[PDB]
Amino acid sequence: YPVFAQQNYANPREANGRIVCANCHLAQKAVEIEVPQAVLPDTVFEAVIELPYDKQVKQVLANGKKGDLNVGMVLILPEGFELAPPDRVPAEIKEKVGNLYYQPYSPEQKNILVVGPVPGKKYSEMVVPILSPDPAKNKNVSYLKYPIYFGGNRGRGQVYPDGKKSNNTIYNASAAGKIVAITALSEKKGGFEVSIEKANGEVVVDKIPAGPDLIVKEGQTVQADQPLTNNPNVGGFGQAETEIVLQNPARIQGLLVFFSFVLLTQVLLVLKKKQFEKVQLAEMNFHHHHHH
């Protein structure tokens, strides 16, 4: 969960650009994010994100049964960029957004937004109303091309903050040996205890929760760290990056005035060329050099 991140990661982004949601959410699935090429100061533009996944398949739920997936995300914006306050968002836009309540990664990091968990059935595609800062007012924000880092996931994680696995990951042989017995646990406890007999004769027991399906039968031999189950996880995390240009109208205006100076000049040049070729053509006539 994004809160997990918040609780265990001061900065959701690592030196190499990896987003922390990946320390636990071990699957990988494409994501999207699109924003305008550029935006004027103190304006509300929208970040459009996509966390595509096959809504047909079902994941292993917390308990042990199979259900629907939820989505969450972390959007990292440039200093100065923050969530547009409801009183700044156009009604029509508010529509595209839906009933989502984007939150600040922390009281300080208002430039980092998180959301979810929420029904990925309805929010596999989201819209985030954002408000560009204003160089005039705020100083530490100039007209530049800024990056935007997006993190997105749908599905349950593989590790908990404390480090222990979960019902949505793969389980491996705590050691090498022979499977002497795969015995189940209370009907209302779920899972099994895979008993593995080493070489010395010692028997170790590997607790496996409900969710993952065993893929080893009794009597077969196994290599340590070998998979005892399949990988139930059907969700996935995905990163993405992009940029946004905080524009200043004045620049494009000057650019336009400049263009006209150029265009003017270019025409005068070629017209002048043509004018003179008149002359050139004339003097190329023999009657110019001979009275006959």
Binding site: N16, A22, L26, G163
Partner: protein, 126 residues
């Protein structure tokens, strides 16, 4: 040589395991100042050997991807197994080793001279 940390203030084997769980493989100051990883045995303890992150291919500091149980270089796709042995090229060699001895924290890195146990071949980083 001694192994300093992020802010460059040496590592206390204890202080390190308070935050670094088991099976841990994160970077730190290593021999020659290069980024050298620090492993945490299954027995939530410091490993005898340290791995130098410098990819033997073209130079990129290789990251540990515990999801696939191995180091995978982001530059040209070099892959070294959990032990540091090159498993995928273009990298031709393995991540140089270094001895990691504890002394009541006071963790220090030692140069490796003996044969590379990961391939029986004598070390190239010597």
């Amino acid at each position: 040589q001694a192994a300093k940390d992020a802010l460059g203030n040496d590592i206390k084997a204890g202080e390190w395991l308070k935050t670094h769980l088991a099976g841990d493989r994160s970077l730190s100051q290593g021999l020659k100042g290069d980024p050298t990883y620090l492993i945490v045995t299954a027995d939530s303890t410091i490993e005898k050997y340290g791995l130098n992150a410098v990819c033997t291919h073209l130079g990129c500091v290789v990251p540990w991807v515990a999801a696939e149980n191995k180091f995978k270089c982001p530059c040209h796709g070099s892959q070294y197994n959990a032990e540091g042995k090159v498993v995928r090229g273009p990298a031709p060699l393995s991540l140089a080793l270094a001895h990691c001895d504890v002394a009541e924290g006071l963790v220090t890195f030692s140069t490796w001279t003996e044969t590379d146990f990961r391939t029986g071949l004598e070390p190239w980083w010597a």
